[PDB]
Amino acid sequence: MGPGFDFAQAIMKKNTVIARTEKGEFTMLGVYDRVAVIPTHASVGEIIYINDVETRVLDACALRDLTDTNLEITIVKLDRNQKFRDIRHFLPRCEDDYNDAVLSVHTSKFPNMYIPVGQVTNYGFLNLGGTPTHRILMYNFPTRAGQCGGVVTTTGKVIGIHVGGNGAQGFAAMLLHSYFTD
C-alpha cells in the first residue's frame, strides 16, 4: 500500500520459503547461498520440508550470545539445488529501535500476509516461554500462532524474525550482519 509494504513484498517474493518441522509450518527467511534462519523453537533436525520438498539439513546452529543466553535464532544450511538472493547488505550492524515496521508471513494458513506493526522497541531481555532470551524487539500488535518466522522489515532493512507474543505485544529476535559473515 506504500514504500514499507513495497520493501517487505520484495523480500517475501524472493527470500522466503515455507519450512515444516515436527513442531509446525514456519515462514523461513533465506539470507544468502543456501543459508536461512528460523526460530530455535522450530527444533530443526537432520531433515526439514522446504515448500513441501524433503531437504537434508547440512548444518544447524542455535545462536546464543557471549553470556551463553538464548537468542532464539537458528541458522540452517539447506541441501537445496538453488541459492537465495544475497540480502546481507539489508541487515543492521547494531542493536537499535525502529519506526514504521512491517511483519510479513507466508504459510499455508496465512499466505501473502502483511501487518503494519508501527514502532519497534529494543526491548532486550524477555522470558520467552520460560527461556531467558536476549536481543528481543517488541511491537504493540496482537500477533497469533502461525506468525513465528515472519520477517520484520523497515524500508531498506531486514531487522528480525517473529518468535512470540503475549496477546497484546509481539516479539522478534534481532538479525545482525555479524551472524552471517563467511
Grid cell listed for 119: 514502532
Q: How far is CA 36 from CA 3, 173, 177, in A?
A: 25, 14, 13
C-alpha cell at 120: 519497534
CB-CB neighbours of 26 under 10 Å? 27
Contact 56, 47 (CB under 8 A): yes
Core vs surface per residue 158-182: b (16+ CB within 10 A) or e: bbbbbbbbeeebbbbbbbbeebbee
Question: Is the separation of the CB atoms in 12 and 151 below 8 Å?
Answer: yes
Kindly tell me the burial class for residue 36, based on how many C-beta atoms sit within 10 Å of its own C-beta (0-12, 13-18, 19 or more). buried
Catalytic residue flag (residue 72): yes
Determined by: X-ray
- The H or E element containing residue 6 is helix 3-15
Q: Which of 25, 106, 134, 148 is catalytic?
A: 148
76: its cell numbers: 540452517
- DSSP reduced 3-state for 178: helix
Strand partners, 111: none
Distance, in Å, from the CA atom of 153 to the CA atom of 14, rounded to the nearest integer, reads: 14
Residues 173/161, Cβ–Cβ less than 8 Å: yes
Where along the chain do its domains lie?
1-15+85-182, 16-84
Q: Is 41 a catalytic residue?
A: yes
- Look up residue 43 and give its three cell numbers: 527444533
Q: How far is CA 102 from CA 56, 109, 151, in A?
A: 31, 19, 8
Which of 25, 72, 106, 162 is catalytic? The answer is: 72
Comparing CA positions, the residue from 145, 134, 151, 135 lying closest to residue 167 is 145
Task: Give the number of other CB atoms < 10 A from CB of residue 43.
Answer: 14
3-state secondary structure of 117: strand
The residue whose grid cell reads 527470500 is 15
154 within 8 A of 101, measured Cβ to Cβ: yes
Output the CA–CA distances (angstroms, integers) from residue 135 to 25, 73, 157, 176, in the order listed. 24, 10, 17, 10
| Given the residues 25, 41, 134, 162, the one annotated as active site | 41
Q: Are 143 and 160 in contact (CB under 8 A)?
A: no
Q: What is the 3-state secondary structure (H, E, C) of 47-110?
A: EEEECCEEEEEEEEEEEECCCCCEEEEEEEEECCCCCECCCHHHCCCCCCCEEEEEEEECCCCC
- Which of 97, 179, 91 has its CA nearest to residue 137? 97
Cβ(102)–Cβ(153) below 8 Å: yes
